[PDB]
Symmetry: C2
Subunit: 337 residues, 2 copies
């Protein structure tokens, strides 16, 4: 089979903020794998702060030899080989993984949620983000979207956390999921900041402290009234077991774990250890978002709005209907170029 | 879909003996699930010393309502519903799981090893047992089948252990895997054994001492020269994690874990936790044997010779070739009635 790839920068509709960073674009590489007339689509999204770039991803993909593989169904052997080409480049490896499942699914004539034996009717509601701004700009956007979602996401980990909730909580009573994003470097300042939110309608807390301080995080979890989910603290399958106890659940993202195959294994592992599972995303096109939505029926929370934040999506895949992630019946990852 | 099932006693070629129980037959129920003209085959084998019977199985299967399910692909929902019908009955449950996978594979037009993305060329060599008897006989049968296998299985933990090995070892140099069955009581006594056996060409120890003494086991394993696998120490997915550090790996049997879906999860979990995996079986037809063989490319050791021990197999499935478990390309579980 043949693989091709090219840079495809994502244009964000509005300033996008993460911790102390902001951007209006996101480096991204689009991947394709052709085989006997069939094409599987893959994608790598690279928020600048995560360490990968157009260059690194393009370089990594140049190092992948797929022509040496005659059977696309050997995802175990093929993706194991891909992983071996470098110690990281998880986003770059995800693009190949995603493209391969798309291809395999197409060849099987089935969506991966089906191949995996899940009920698409059990997909969750996805959160949508309420950016940080002035009490006016805030209540405005909250107003504009509260009618389309069942749960909203707020990126706290800031200074006016208690502020945002109030502003937002004034013009809406929708449950809120907060992502400190490692903003609360303290310990007690984070624990109580949670009982508070819990009193103000928040229903889940994600990545409170920085990954480095696992002791603080762990500590804060058994004393937290709301489920804490690991994000920055977990990258791949081998990082899951070590988080039991420290977190209530894990947040899986294809760009971080290297794709669908490892992601699915993480869902199985997390659950086997009694942990909860949520699925997240970076700003991505409908390619990676749909790929991850394929296993969303098996999770508890989903932050799969990535494609809604960009203006140059090149695929029509999963739609948000009645606030829920909605899978179509297209085979593979479920998108149409 | 319509599920039918009827008793099908397995006739063993020779007296089969385990521990203190000898028999020449095996209670077994054959299951079939029909959907739009496609039929999936399932099976439940019940060694009369493992709690289930033709009755327990037949009654459980009668409590199963599948006509309420319009979509065979919903394996998660369906098998979850089947598991909820009772606290045990794993064999009866495994039968429904197996038939459902066969059906789904057939509808997808692919074998499960392929759906799971494995390389069929990586199937393992399977063992065959050299029962206990007199030197002439031991050395006899040992020579009658050593030409067709690459590894032989021997149930130790008895009084005639040290000499049983030397007997077989006298007429063959084939590596040996031993199944102690919680035999060795003294923990120091068992550790020395693994040393003597490894000296006599043994490459694997299965369930050395009792399960209620995981402590001694863990002790032995941390310093054992050979990998130790758990069999009696576990039954289902939920029991796997509780063996990490104590055992080198786990042995999976469809009749105990309720089938393929859970088995596949067990393989993922064990590997995720750094443990090894092996797959076994009860005396069964090629239905259950081929079903389990579908994920054998992902295991380290395999004892999949069940069908070879019976004289009334109803299916043609995986074959032993050059000592290797050999998968064919038939969809589903890989069998032909
Ligand atoms: Mg996050
Ligand atoms: Mg055994």
């Amino acid at each position: 089979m043949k693989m091709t790839f090219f840079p495809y920068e994502l244009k964000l509709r509005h300033v996008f903020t993460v911790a102390t960073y902001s951007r209006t674009t996101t480096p991204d590489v689009q991947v394709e794998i052709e085989y006997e007339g069939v094409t599987g689509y893959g994608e790598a999204s690279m928020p600048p702060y995560l360490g990968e770039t157009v260059e690194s991803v393009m370089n990594f993909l140049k190092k992948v030899n797929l022509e040496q593989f005659s059977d696309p169904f050997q995802l175990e052997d093929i993706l194991s080989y891909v992983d071996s080409l470098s110690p990281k480049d998880t986003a770059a490896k995800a693009a190949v993984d995603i493209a391969l499942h798309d291809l395999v699914g197409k060849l099987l004539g089935a969506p991966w949620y089906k191949i995996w034996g899940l009920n698409k009717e059990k997909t969750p509601s996805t959160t949508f983000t309420i950016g940080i701004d002035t009490p006016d700009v805030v209540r405005a956007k909250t107003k504009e979207c509260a009618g389309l979602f069942n749960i909203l996401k707020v990126k706290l980990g800031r200074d006016n956390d208690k502020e945002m909730i109030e502003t937002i909580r004034s013009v809406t009573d929708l449950p809120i999921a907060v992502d400190a994003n490692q903003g609360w470097k303290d310990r007690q300042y984070a624990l109580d900041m949670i009982h508070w939110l819990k009193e103000k309608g928040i229903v889940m807390i994600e990545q409170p402290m920085p990954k480095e301080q696992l002791d603080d995080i762990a500590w804060v979890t058994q004393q937290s009234p709301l489920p804490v989910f690991a994000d920055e603290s977990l990258q791949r399958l081998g990082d899951v077991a070590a988080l039991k106890g420290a977190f209530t659940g894990i947040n899986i993202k294809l760009m971080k774990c290297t794709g669908m195959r490892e992601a699915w294994k993480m869902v199985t592992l997390a659950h086997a250890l009694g942990m909860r599972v949520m699925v997240g995303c970076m700003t991505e096109t409908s390619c990676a978002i749909s790929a991850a939505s394929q296993f969303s029926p098996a999770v508890d929370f989903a932050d799969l709005d990535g494609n809604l934040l960009i203006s140059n999506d090149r695929f029509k895949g999963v739609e948000v209907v009645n606030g829920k992630i909605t899978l179509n019946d297209l085979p593979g990852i479920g998108v149409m170029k």
